[PDB]
């Protein structure tokens, strides 16, 4: 198995489908994202196609088997409400946590600005993943708050079943 397998360090990779593009995060050696963005289908990343490891239409979340030589993000362990969201345009929007899976937007931005960011991971100022963006809440083209799935939900999804035939 002598393979160079040279790659650049990057916990978050760019993932896209045949309808839209979004970002995913690898937690515990497992990629994570929302179902409406990726869904239970093949994902084309920078390396190529990706195999499906976990799927949950009810929870709107899917995961892929992380290839070897990949990094992972630890869970948040600081009780910090403030969170940082990674946008596909290399933009970080400070989001204050207002619940287990609910947050608020300090700067009112158009929904288009947040589009293409679902699946991205949110990291607390300490430097640990806190969850993944799922959808934004807006009234008339302006989003004032956002919703994300905490990393704790991932533990129950994998524990409930391992998608084994």
């Amino acid at each position: 198995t002598g393979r160079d397998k040279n790659q650049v360090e990057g916990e978050v990779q760019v993932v896209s489908t045949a309808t839209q593009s979004f970002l995913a995060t690898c937690v515990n050696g497992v990629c994570w994202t929302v179902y409406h963005g990726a869904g239970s289908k093949t994902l084309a990343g920078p390396k190529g196609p990706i195999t499906q490891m976990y799927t949950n239409v009810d929870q709107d979340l899917v995961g892929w088997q992380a290839p070897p030589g990949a990094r992972s993000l630890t869970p948040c362990t600081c009780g910090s409400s403030d969170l940082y969201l990674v946008t596909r345009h290399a933009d970080v929007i400070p989001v204050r946590r207002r619940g287990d899976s609910r947050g608020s937007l300090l700067s009112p931005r158009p929904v288009s600005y947040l589009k293409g960011s679902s699946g991205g991971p949110l990291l607390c100022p300490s430097g640990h993943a806190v969850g993944i963006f799922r959808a934004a809440v807006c009234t008339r083209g302006v989003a004032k708050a956002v919703d994300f799935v905490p990393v704790e939900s991932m533990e129950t999804t994998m524990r409930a079943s391992k998608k084994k035939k």
Partner: peptide
């Protein structure tokens, strides 16, 4: 709103 879903974004994805």
């Amino acid at each position: 709103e879903l974004x994805x």
